[PDB]
PDB file of C-alpha atoms and ligand atoms in Angstrom:
ATOM      1  CA  UNK A   1       0.066   0.036   0.012  1.00 28.30           C
ATOM      2  CA  UNK A   2       1.783   3.098  -1.354  1.00 29.09           C
ATOM      3  CA  UNK A   3       0.320   6.643  -1.124  1.00 30.51           C
ATOM      4  CA  UNK A   4      -1.284   7.125  -4.556  1.00 30.82           C
ATOM      5  CA  UNK A   5      -4.177   8.236  -6.712  1.00 30.95           C
ATOM      6  CA  UNK A   6      -6.877   5.695  -6.589  1.00 31.55           C
ATOM      7  CA  UNK A   7      -9.011   7.401  -9.313  1.00 32.32           C
ATOM      8  CA  UNK A   8     -10.264  10.798 -10.409  1.00 33.14           C
ATOM      9  CA  UNK A   9     -13.786  12.035 -10.511  1.00 32.90           C
ATOM     10  CA  UNK A  10     -15.548  14.802 -12.264  1.00 31.53           C
ATOM     11  CA  UNK A  11     -16.660  17.447  -9.851  1.00 33.85           C
ATOM     12  CA  UNK A  12     -19.847  19.408 -10.755  1.00 31.34           C
ATOM     13  CA  UNK A  13     -18.769  23.007  -9.888  1.00 31.87           C
ATOM     14  CA  UNK A  14     -22.277  24.290  -9.509  1.00 35.74           C
ATOM     15  CA  UNK A  15     -23.441  21.860  -6.954  1.00 36.59           C
ATOM     16  CA  UNK A  16     -19.958  21.919  -5.345  1.00 37.08           C
ATOM     17  CA  UNK A  17     -20.046  25.750  -4.851  1.00 37.43           C
ATOM     18  CA  UNK A  18     -23.325  25.378  -3.019  1.00 37.39           C
ATOM     19  CA  UNK A  19     -22.012  22.846  -0.517  1.00 38.67           C
ATOM     20  CA  UNK A  20     -18.714  24.692  -0.022  1.00 39.58           C
ATOM     21  CA  UNK A  21     -20.743  27.891   0.608  1.00 37.56           C
ATOM     22  CA  UNK A  22     -22.633  26.054   3.540  1.00 39.84           C
ATOM     23  CA  UNK A  23     -19.194  24.684   4.863  1.00 39.98           C
ATOM     24  CA  UNK A  24     -17.686  28.223   4.905  1.00 38.36           C
ATOM     25  CA  UNK A  25     -20.303  29.010   7.669  1.00 41.48           C
ATOM     26  CA  UNK A  26     -20.359  25.609   9.425  1.00 43.35           C
ATOM     27  CA  UNK A  27     -19.141  25.119  12.956  1.00 40.35           C
ATOM     28  CA  UNK A  28     -15.901  23.083  12.772  1.00 37.39           C
ATOM     29  CA  UNK A  29     -14.778  20.726  15.658  1.00 40.10           C
ATOM     30  CA  UNK A  30     -12.125  21.704  17.897  1.00 39.14           C
ATOM     31  CA  UNK A  31     -11.102  18.019  18.517  1.00 38.81           C
ATOM     32  CA  UNK A  32      -7.568  17.182  17.442  1.00 36.40           C
ATOM     33  CA  UNK A  33      -6.580  20.923  17.639  1.00 36.14           C
ATOM     34  CA  UNK A  34      -3.466  19.516  19.494  1.00 36.62           C
ATOM     35  CA  UNK A  35      -2.383  18.395  16.098  1.00 35.85           C
ATOM     36  CA  UNK A  36      -3.053  21.796  14.324  1.00 35.53           C
ATOM     37  CA  UNK A  37      -0.509  24.560  13.788  1.00 35.20           C
ATOM     38  CA  UNK A  38      -3.021  27.449  13.267  1.00 35.41           C
ATOM     39  CA  UNK A  39      -6.349  26.810  11.472  1.00 37.66           C
ATOM     40  CA  UNK A  40      -6.205  23.116  10.622  1.00 36.23           C
ATOM     41  CA  UNK A  41      -9.673  21.761  11.476  1.00 36.52           C
ATOM     42  CA  UNK A  42     -12.407  19.344  10.431  1.00 33.47           C
ATOM     43  CA  UNK A  43     -16.168  18.636  10.741  1.00 30.12           C
ATOM     44  CA  UNK A  44     -18.055  15.327  10.743  1.00 29.03           C
ATOM     45  CA  UNK A  45     -20.210  14.449   7.668  1.00 31.61           C
ATOM     46  CA  UNK A  46     -20.709  10.805   8.682  1.00 32.32           C
ATOM     47  CA  UNK A  47     -19.716   8.858  11.902  1.00 30.03           C
ATOM     48  CA  UNK A  48     -20.774   6.112  14.133  1.00 30.54           C
ATOM     49  CA  UNK A  49     -23.974   7.432  15.646  1.00 34.57           C
ATOM     50  CA  UNK A  50     -24.933  10.081  13.179  1.00 33.44           C
ATOM     51  CA  UNK A  51     -24.740  12.710  15.881  1.00 35.20           C
ATOM     52  CA  UNK A  52     -22.956  16.018  15.605  1.00 32.38           C
ATOM     53  CA  UNK A  53     -21.646  15.675  18.974  1.00 29.79           C
ATOM     54  CA  UNK A  54     -19.560  12.564  18.090  1.00 33.08           C
ATOM     55  CA  UNK A  55     -16.227  14.123  16.936  1.00 32.78           C
ATOM     56  CA  UNK A  56     -13.305  11.739  17.879  1.00 32.82           C
ATOM     57  CA  UNK A  57     -12.550   8.704  15.902  1.00 30.64           C
ATOM     58  CA  UNK A  58     -12.252   5.036  17.074  1.00 30.58           C
ATOM     59  CA  UNK A  59     -12.097   1.776  15.220  1.00 30.21           C
ATOM     60  CA  UNK A  60     -15.777   0.521  14.973  1.00 30.35           C
ATOM     61  CA  UNK A  61     -17.947  -1.786  12.730  1.00 29.37           C
ATOM     62  CA  UNK A  62     -20.844   0.500  11.793  1.00 28.25           C
ATOM     63  CA  UNK A  63     -21.662   1.665   8.276  1.00 28.11           C
ATOM     64  CA  UNK A  64     -21.244   5.351   9.007  1.00 27.07           C
ATOM     65  CA  UNK A  65     -24.344   7.535   9.306  1.00 26.90           C
ATOM     66  CA  UNK A  66     -24.810  10.981   7.963  1.00 28.50           C
ATOM     67  CA  UNK A  67     -24.751  13.772  10.718  1.00 28.58           C
ATOM     68  CA  UNK A  68     -27.097  16.680  10.372  1.00 32.58           C
ATOM     69  CA  UNK A  69     -24.163  18.560   8.671  1.00 30.50           C
ATOM     70  CA  UNK A  70     -23.690  15.522   6.354  1.00 33.35           C
ATOM     71  CA  UNK A  71     -27.423  15.657   5.497  1.00 31.87           C
ATOM     72  CA  UNK A  72     -27.277  19.366   4.683  1.00 30.34           C
ATOM     73  CA  UNK A  73     -24.478  18.778   2.093  1.00 29.04           C
ATOM     74  CA  UNK A  74     -26.483  16.849  -0.601  1.00 27.64           C
ATOM     75  CA  UNK A  75     -23.797  16.872  -3.386  1.00 26.18           C
ATOM     76  CA  UNK A  76     -21.031  15.763  -0.903  1.00 26.44           C
ATOM     77  CA  UNK A  77     -23.499  13.118   0.263  1.00 26.83           C
ATOM     78  CA  UNK A  78     -23.982  11.961  -3.328  1.00 28.91           C
ATOM     79  CA  UNK A  79     -20.288  11.674  -3.932  1.00 26.06           C
ATOM     80  CA  UNK A  80     -19.856   9.545  -0.766  1.00 22.58           C
ATOM     81  CA  UNK A  81     -22.856   7.358  -2.089  1.00 24.11           C
ATOM     82  CA  UNK A  82     -21.454   6.991  -5.602  1.00 27.70           C
ATOM     83  CA  UNK A  83     -17.622   6.573  -5.158  1.00 28.64           C
ATOM     84  CA  UNK A  84     -17.481   4.455  -2.054  1.00 31.19           C
ATOM     85  CA  UNK A  85     -19.174   1.324  -0.587  1.00 31.16           C
ATOM     86  CA  UNK A  86     -21.529   2.474   2.200  1.00 32.09           C
ATOM     87  CA  UNK A  87     -20.883  -0.241   4.616  1.00 34.30           C
ATOM     88  CA  UNK A  88     -17.065   0.172   4.437  1.00 29.93           C
ATOM     89  CA  UNK A  89     -17.150   3.863   5.447  1.00 29.79           C
ATOM     90  CA  UNK A  90     -16.449   4.450   9.181  1.00 30.04           C
ATOM     91  CA  UNK A  91     -16.114   8.249   9.018  1.00 32.80           C
ATOM     92  CA  UNK A  92     -16.434  11.119   6.470  1.00 34.20           C
ATOM     93  CA  UNK A  93     -15.123  14.515   7.301  1.00 33.97           C
ATOM     94  CA  UNK A  94     -14.325  17.814   5.664  1.00 39.08           C
ATOM     95  CA  UNK A  95     -10.809  18.942   6.462  1.00 44.45           C
ATOM     96  CA  UNK A  96     -10.051  22.607   5.901  1.00 44.82           C
ATOM     97  CA  UNK A  97      -6.683  24.273   6.222  1.00 47.49           C
ATOM     98  CA  UNK A  98      -6.691  28.026   6.120  1.00 48.70           C
ATOM     99  CA  UNK A  99      -3.837  30.481   5.179  1.00 50.52           C
ATOM    100  CA  UNK A 100      -0.435  29.445   6.493  1.00 52.35           C
ATOM    101  CA  UNK A 101      -1.635  26.674   8.629  1.00 55.45           C
ATOM    102  CA  UNK A 102      -0.625  23.036   8.868  1.00 54.36           C
ATOM    103  CA  UNK A 103      -1.111  19.833  10.606  1.00 52.70           C
ATOM    104  CA  UNK A 104       1.978  19.119  12.715  1.00 54.27           C
ATOM    105  CA  UNK A 105       4.071  16.130  11.281  1.00 57.53           C
ATOM    106  CA  UNK A 106       2.525  12.963  12.652  1.00 59.45           C
ATOM    107  CA  UNK A 107       1.457   9.436  12.188  1.00 61.28           C
ATOM    108  CA  UNK A 108      -2.071   8.440  12.642  1.00 61.01           C
ATOM    109  CA  UNK A 109      -3.661   5.419  14.224  1.00 64.69           C
ATOM    110  CA  UNK A 110      -1.258   5.031  17.109  1.00 65.43           C
ATOM    111  CA  UNK A 111      -4.123   5.384  19.659  1.00 66.43           C
ATOM    112  CA  UNK A 112      -6.384   3.109  17.670  1.00 63.13           C
ATOM    113  CA  UNK A 113      -7.009  -0.609  18.043  1.00 63.97           C
ATOM    114  CA  UNK A 114      -6.177  -1.204  14.271  1.00 64.93           C
ATOM    115  CA  UNK A 115      -6.015   1.278  11.416  1.00 63.76           C
ATOM    116  CA  UNK A 116      -8.312   2.845   8.806  1.00 65.34           C
ATOM    117  CA  UNK A 117      -7.704   3.050   5.208  1.00 65.92           C
ATOM    118  CA  UNK A 118      -7.676   6.853   4.739  1.00 67.43           C
ATOM    119  CA  UNK A 119      -8.901   8.446   1.519  1.00 69.46           C
ATOM    120  CA  UNK A 120      -8.891  11.984   0.250  1.00 71.05           C
ATOM    121  CA  UNK A 121     -11.221  13.411  -2.328  1.00 73.67           C
ATOM    122  CA  UNK A 122      -9.907  16.915  -3.100  1.00 73.03           C
ATOM    123  CA  UNK A 123     -12.682  19.498  -3.330  1.00 70.65           C
ATOM    124  CA  UNK A 124     -10.965  22.923  -3.266  1.00 72.51           C
ATOM    125  CA  UNK A 125      -7.359  23.550  -3.514  1.00 70.38           C
ATOM    126  CA  UNK A 126      -4.562  25.394  -5.329  1.00 72.80           C
ATOM    127  CA  UNK A 127      -0.842  25.348  -6.052  1.00 71.63           C
ATOM    128  CA  UNK A 128       0.201  26.630  -2.827  1.00 70.29           C
ATOM    129  CA  UNK A 129      -1.319  23.629  -0.817  1.00 75.02           C
ATOM    130  CA  UNK A 130       0.921  20.717  -0.266  1.00 73.30           C
ATOM    131  CA  UNK A 131       0.913  17.288   1.387  1.00 71.14           C
ATOM    132  CA  UNK A 132       4.138  15.723   2.591  1.00 70.82           C
ATOM    133  CA  UNK A 133       5.279  12.184   3.351  1.00 69.58           C
ATOM    134  CA  UNK A 134       8.712  11.319   4.751  1.00 72.25           C
ATOM    135  CA  UNK A 135      11.110  13.127   2.398  1.00 71.56           C
ATOM    136  CA  UNK A 136       8.660  13.887  -0.239  1.00 70.35           C
ATOM    137  CA  UNK A 137       6.202  16.678  -1.084  1.00 67.77           C
ATOM    138  CA  UNK A 138       3.235  16.517  -3.516  1.00 66.56           C
ATOM    139  CA  UNK A 139       0.123  18.171  -4.533  1.00 63.14           C
ATOM    140  CA  UNK A 140      -3.187  16.428  -4.410  1.00 60.24           C
ATOM    141  CA  UNK A 141      -5.351  17.912  -7.355  1.00 58.78           C
ATOM    142  CA  UNK A 142      -9.011  18.755  -7.506  1.00 59.77           C
ATOM    143  CA  UNK A 143     -11.124  15.682  -8.223  1.00 60.98           C
ATOM    144  CA  UNK A 144      -8.415  13.317  -7.369  1.00 60.43           C
ATOM    145  CA  UNK A 145      -9.065  10.368  -4.941  1.00 62.11           C
ATOM    146  CA  UNK A 146      -5.857   9.669  -2.983  1.00 61.99           C
ATOM    147  CA  UNK A 147      -5.064   6.788  -0.632  1.00 63.92           C
ATOM    148  CA  UNK A 148      -2.942   8.325   2.087  1.00 65.34           C
ATOM    149  CA  UNK A 149      -0.681   5.975   3.946  1.00 64.16           C
ATOM    150  CA  UNK A 150      -1.212   7.786   7.313  1.00 62.30           C
ATOM    151  CA  UNK A 151       0.840   5.279   9.201  1.00 64.15           C
ATOM    152  CA  UNK A 152       3.965   6.903   7.769  1.00 59.74           C
ATOM    153  CA  UNK A 153       5.193  10.381   8.970  1.00 61.84           C
ATOM    154  CA  UNK A 154       3.171  13.080   7.023  1.00 62.63           C
ATOM    155  CA  UNK A 155       1.818  16.533   7.050  1.00 62.75           C
ATOM    156  CA  UNK A 156      -0.332  18.925   4.995  1.00 62.43           C
ATOM    157  CA  UNK A 157      -0.326  22.766   4.771  1.00 64.30           C
ATOM    158  CA  UNK A 158      -2.068  25.648   2.988  1.00 65.18           C
ATOM    159  CA  UNK A 159      -0.034  28.695   2.105  1.00 65.11           C
ATOM    160  CA  UNK A 160      -2.670  30.673   0.101  1.00 63.29           C
ATOM    161  CA  UNK A 161      -5.057  33.377   1.077  1.00 62.06           C
ATOM    162  CA  UNK A 162      -7.880  30.916   0.011  1.00 62.33           C
ATOM    163  CA  UNK A 163      -8.627  27.889   2.222  1.00 64.63           C
ATOM    164  CA  UNK A 164      -8.048  24.218   1.151  1.00 63.95           C
ATOM    165  CA  UNK A 165     -10.938  21.677   1.642  1.00 61.08           C
ATOM    166  CA  UNK A 166     -10.624  17.889   1.296  1.00 59.21           C
ATOM    167  CA  UNK A 167     -13.302  15.248   1.743  1.00 60.25           C
ATOM    168  CA  UNK A 168     -11.516  12.656   3.975  1.00 58.51           C
ATOM    169  CA  UNK A 169     -12.995   9.211   4.211  1.00 59.24           C
ATOM    170  CA  UNK A 170     -11.921   6.497   6.747  1.00 58.65           C
ATOM    171  CA  UNK A 171     -12.633   3.022   5.273  1.00 57.88           C
ATOM    172  CA  UNK A 172     -12.592  -0.038   7.484  1.00 58.11           C
ATOM    173  CA  UNK A 173      -8.938  -1.150   7.776  1.00 55.30           C
ATOM    174  CA  UNK A 174      -9.073  -4.618   6.409  1.00 56.70           C
ATOM    175  CA  UNK A 175     -10.781  -3.692   3.023  1.00 58.03           C
ATOM    176  CA  UNK A 176      -8.918  -4.311  -0.284  1.00 60.99           C
ATOM    177  CA  UNK A 177      -7.484  -0.983  -1.407  1.00 59.55           C
ATOM    178  CA  UNK A 178      -8.084  -1.701  -5.088  1.00 61.31           C
ATOM    179  CA  UNK A 179     -11.741  -2.143  -4.317  1.00 60.11           C
ATOM    180  CA  UNK A 180     -12.341   1.128  -2.349  1.00 59.43           C
ATOM    181  CA  UNK A 181     -12.891   3.665  -5.172  1.00 58.53           C
ATOM    182  CA  UNK A 182     -16.027   3.047  -7.181  1.00 56.14           C
ATOM    183  CA  UNK A 183     -17.199   4.549 -10.383  1.00 57.45           C
ATOM    184  CA  UNK A 184     -13.889   6.361 -10.869  1.00 58.64           C
ATOM    185  CA  UNK A 185     -11.900   7.032 -14.030  1.00 62.30           C
ATOM    186  CA  UNK A 186      -8.384   5.625 -14.013  1.00 64.65           C
ATOM    187  CA  UNK A 187      -5.914   8.548 -13.867  1.00 62.86           C
ATOM    188  CA  UNK A 188      -3.591   8.899 -16.770  1.00 66.83           C
ATOM    189  CA  UNK A 189       0.126   9.129 -16.066  1.00 67.23           C
ATOM    190  CA  UNK A 190       1.407  12.620 -15.880  1.00 68.13           C
ATOM    191  CA  UNK A 191       4.560  14.709 -15.509  1.00 68.83           C
ATOM    192  CA  UNK A 192       6.186  14.034 -12.153  1.00 68.26           C
ATOM    193  CA  UNK A 193       6.007  17.061  -9.891  1.00 74.55           C
ATOM    194  CA  UNK A 194       9.526  18.168  -9.226  1.00 72.96           C
ATOM    195  CA  UNK A 195      10.369  19.101  -5.713  1.00 72.29           C
ATOM    196  CA  UNK A 196      10.891  22.859  -5.807  1.00 73.40           C
ATOM    197  CA  UNK A 197      12.016  23.209  -2.172  1.00 74.38           C
ATOM    198  CA  UNK A 198      15.394  24.709  -1.129  1.00 76.73           C
ATOM    199  CA  UNK A 199      18.403  22.429  -0.445  1.00 78.20           C
ATOM    200  CA  UNK A 200      18.997  22.167   3.331  1.00 81.92           C
ATOM    201  CA  UNK A 201      22.441  23.636   4.290  1.00 80.64           C
ATOM    202  CA  UNK A 202      24.706  24.026   7.344  1.00 81.41           C
ATOM    203  CA  UNK A 203      23.722  27.674   7.459  1.00 82.68           C
ATOM    204  CA  UNK A 204      19.922  27.077   7.535  1.00 84.78           C
ATOM    205  CA  UNK A 205      20.552  24.349  10.221  1.00 84.52           C
ATOM    206  CA  UNK A 206      22.804  26.591  12.514  1.00 86.46           C
ATOM    207  CA  UNK A 207      20.208  29.279  12.119  1.00 87.57           C
ATOM    208  CA  UNK A 208      17.516  26.960  13.455  1.00 90.75           C
ATOM    209  CA  UNK A 209      19.616  25.518  16.135  1.00 91.34           C
ATOM    210  CA  UNK A 210      20.275  29.235  17.216  1.00 88.49           C
ATOM    211  CA  UNK A 211      16.803  29.227  18.798  1.00 88.80           C
ATOM    212  CA  UNK A 212      18.502  27.515  21.802  1.00 87.70           C
ATOM    213  CA  UNK A 213      19.414  31.040  22.931  1.00 87.76           C
ATOM    214  CA  UNK A 214      15.795  32.291  23.066  1.00 88.81           C
ATOM    215  CA  UNK A 215      13.505  29.325  23.427  1.00 88.25           C
ATOM    216  CA  UNK A 216      11.316  29.401  26.497  1.00 87.96           C
ATOM    217  CA  UNK A 217       7.778  28.393  27.718  1.00 88.73           C
ATOM    218  CA  UNK A 218       6.699  31.803  26.421  1.00 87.54           C
ATOM    219  CA  UNK A 219       7.550  31.139  22.789  1.00 84.62           C
ATOM    220  CA  UNK A 220       7.516  27.401  22.578  1.00 81.84           C
ATOM    221  CA  UNK A 221       4.327  27.180  20.508  1.00 79.15           C
ATOM    222  CA  UNK A 222       5.486  29.683  17.926  1.00 76.54           C
ATOM    223  CA  UNK A 223       8.832  27.844  17.457  1.00 78.50           C
ATOM    224  CA  UNK A 224       7.171  24.440  17.183  1.00 76.39           C
ATOM    225  CA  UNK A 225       4.941  25.945  14.401  1.00 73.19           C
ATOM    226  CA  UNK A 226       7.939  27.551  12.507  1.00 66.70           C
ATOM    227  CA  UNK A 227       9.746  24.210  12.742  1.00 63.94           C
ATOM    228  CA  UNK A 228       6.742  22.242  11.451  1.00 64.32           C
ATOM    229  CA  UNK A 229       6.366  24.543   8.454  1.00 63.23           C
ATOM    230  CA  UNK A 230      10.004  24.467   7.257  1.00 64.93           C
ATOM    231  CA  UNK A 231       9.711  21.014   5.398  1.00 64.45           C
ATOM    232  CA  UNK A 232       7.053  22.577   3.094  1.00 61.48           C
ATOM    233  CA  UNK A 233       9.845  24.862   1.597  1.00 62.05           C
ATOM    234  CA  UNK A 234      13.234  23.072   2.489  1.00 62.33           C
ATOM    235  CA  UNK A 235      14.275  19.593   1.325  1.00 60.96           C
ATOM    236  CA  UNK A 236      14.206  17.859   4.704  1.00 64.24           C
ATOM    237  CA  UNK A 237      12.339  14.878   6.312  1.00 61.45           C
ATOM    238  CA  UNK A 238       8.836  15.381   7.957  1.00 60.37           C
ATOM    239  CA  UNK A 239      10.198  14.243  11.265  1.00 57.26           C
ATOM    240  CA  UNK A 240      13.464  16.342  11.311  1.00 60.11           C
ATOM    241  CA  UNK A 241      11.564  19.072  13.152  1.00 60.44           C
ATOM    242  CA  UNK A 242      11.633  17.019  16.293  1.00 57.88           C
ATOM    243  CA  UNK A 243      15.377  16.378  16.215  1.00 60.10           C
ATOM    244  CA  UNK A 244      15.972  20.103  15.755  1.00 62.03           C
ATOM    245  CA  UNK A 245      13.640  20.922  18.721  1.00 61.95           C
ATOM    246  CA  UNK A 246      15.359  18.263  20.835  1.00 61.22           C
ATOM    247  CA  UNK A 247      18.876  19.788  20.053  1.00 58.56           C
ATOM    248  CA  UNK A 248      17.615  23.350  20.421  1.00 64.48           C
ATOM    249  CA  UNK A 249      16.342  22.287  23.991  1.00 65.26           C
ATOM    250  CA  UNK A 250      19.521  20.315  24.874  1.00 66.87           C
ATOM    251  CA  UNK A 251      21.649  23.370  24.184  1.00 66.46           C
ATOM    252  CA  UNK A 252      19.248  25.622  26.129  1.00 64.91           C
ATOM    253  CA  UNK A 253      19.836  23.237  29.043  1.00 63.87           C
ATOM    254  CA  UNK A 254      16.350  23.770  30.901  1.00 64.96           C
ATOM    255  CA  UNK A 255      14.971  20.351  32.077  1.00 64.27           C
ATOM    256  CA  UNK A 256      11.240  21.332  31.411  1.00 66.38           C
ATOM    257  CA  UNK A 257      11.784  22.253  27.814  1.00 64.10           C
ATOM    258  CA  UNK A 258      13.806  19.021  27.118  1.00 66.37           C
ATOM    259  CA  UNK A 259      11.083  16.865  28.568  1.00 67.25           C
ATOM    260  CA  UNK A 260       8.389  18.729  26.518  1.00 65.74           C
ATOM    261  CA  UNK A 261      10.362  18.196  23.335  1.00 61.88           C
ATOM    262  CA  UNK A 262      10.708  14.410  24.077  1.00 62.05           C
ATOM    263  CA  UNK A 263       6.878  14.157  24.775  1.00 62.99           C
ATOM    264  CA  UNK A 264       6.013  16.005  21.682  1.00 60.05           C
ATOM    265  CA  UNK A 265       7.838  13.677  19.356  1.00 60.68           C
ATOM    266  CA  UNK A 266       6.674  10.689  21.232  1.00 60.19           C
ATOM    267  CA  UNK A 267       3.007  11.748  21.060  1.00 63.08           C
ATOM    268  CA  UNK A 268       2.961  12.563  17.371  1.00 65.07           C
ATOM    269  CA  UNK A 269       5.212   9.753  16.087  1.00 66.53           C
ATOM    270  CA  UNK A 270       5.810   6.982  18.656  1.00 67.46           C
ATOM    271  CA  UNK A 271       3.140   6.259  21.283  1.00 67.85           C
ATOM    272  CA  UNK A 272      -0.215   7.686  22.454  1.00 67.14           C
ATOM    273  CA  UNK A 273      -3.361   6.326  24.249  1.00 65.91           C
ATOM    274  CA  UNK A 274      -7.009   6.629  23.336  1.00 61.38           C
ATOM    275  CA  UNK A 275      -8.403  10.037  24.317  1.00 64.76           C
ATOM    276  CA  UNK A 276      -4.893  11.320  25.148  1.00 65.56           C
ATOM    277  CA  UNK A 277      -4.383  15.017  24.175  1.00 65.59           C
ATOM    278  CA  UNK A 278      -0.941  16.909  23.829  1.00 63.77           C
ATOM    279  CA  UNK A 279      -1.054  20.319  25.395  1.00 61.59           C
ATOM    280  CA  UNK A 280       2.197  22.216  24.841  1.00 64.00           C
TER     281      UNK A 280
HETATM  282  O1  LIG B   1      -4.617  16.934   4.403  1.00 63.73           O
HETATM  283  C1  LIG B   1      -4.970  17.086   5.581  1.00 63.73           C
HETATM  284  O2  LIG B   1      -5.625  18.132   6.045  1.00 63.73           O
HETATM  285  C2  LIG B   1      -4.657  16.077   6.630  1.00 63.73           C
HETATM  286  C3  LIG B   1      -3.633  15.025   6.278  1.00 63.73           C
HETATM  287  C4  LIG B   1      -3.630  14.020   7.385  1.00 63.73           C
HETATM  288  O3  LIG B   1      -2.889  14.267   8.276  1.00 63.73           O
HETATM  289  C5  LIG B   1      -4.619  12.871   7.392  1.00 63.73           C
HETATM  290  O4  LIG B   1      -5.610  12.882   6.488  1.00 63.73           O
HETATM  291  O5  LIG B   1      -4.367  11.962   8.083  1.00 63.73           O
HETATM  292  O1  LIG B   2      -6.861  10.098  12.807  1.00 61.11           O
HETATM  293  C1  LIG B   2      -7.362  11.206  12.975  1.00 61.11           C
HETATM  294  O2  LIG B   2      -8.536  11.363  12.514  1.00 61.11           O
HETATM  295  C2  LIG B   2      -6.793  12.348  13.871  1.00 61.11           C
HETATM  296  C3  LIG B   2      -6.799  13.579  13.136  1.00 61.11           C
HETATM  297  C4  LIG B   2      -5.298  14.011  12.705  1.00 61.11           C
HETATM  298  C5  LIG B   2      -4.503  13.300  13.775  1.00 61.11           C
HETATM  299  N1  LIG B   2      -5.346  12.083  14.146  1.00 61.11           N
HETATM  300 CO1  LIG B   3      -2.638  12.312   9.322  1.00 65.28          CO
END
């Protein structure tokens, strides 16, 4: 299971515009804000109970049910009906990233008894929106249905004035990946997207490690966000931010900041429990 395009669909811009206008005014969940650097957020379209109040994810066996929000988005409802198997869906969300926001580099599923198969259908995006995986950066285009191997280190950012919205579907984890996307066109091969990021250098590295002189509890959040965003513009690994933070704090020499840095990396990449939240 490599991250890839499963298929491509035609989006109907008129009907899409209508549902996007409703989502622009919708109440988004604050759950998993511990993963957000800025305005990375989602809302529930389908979940276990069909209730708007149910906003965290667990592995379960129920064909997901449309929430009231779900029901008020009839075109997105239709897409879900037509391009996936109903009984295989466990969640469907809209995930929006607004200007200069990202989800912090992480792996998913650590707190879950099992995994999902995570699928993105891109609704509204642009050239300044990126997803990343390990050492790579790529753009998921409008109408593309992508399988995301969320068990690998990854992130996603939006660096445009305009927000980016993806329909994200969690399919029960033992399903056959080739069977997931229904009624889709096979994508043609295309030009590889070349990685336009800057080469990482000893200068850029020393500059980052220089924050050892100023890092404190008062600016920790800002520094973490800056570090998280670097791999969208420099050729470095998703996870390198955590090594940088650890070395920044080792040089600073304050025990509290070193412990936090260890916990940060651990929570996002190594180990966390069900319902556990990372406040930093
Ligand atoms: O593209 C996004 O907003 C989120 C990417 C991600 O971390 C996920 O879907 O697991
Ligand atoms: O798996 C999930 O849905 C949450 C959201 C991002 C981090 N983990
Ligand atoms: Co993820």
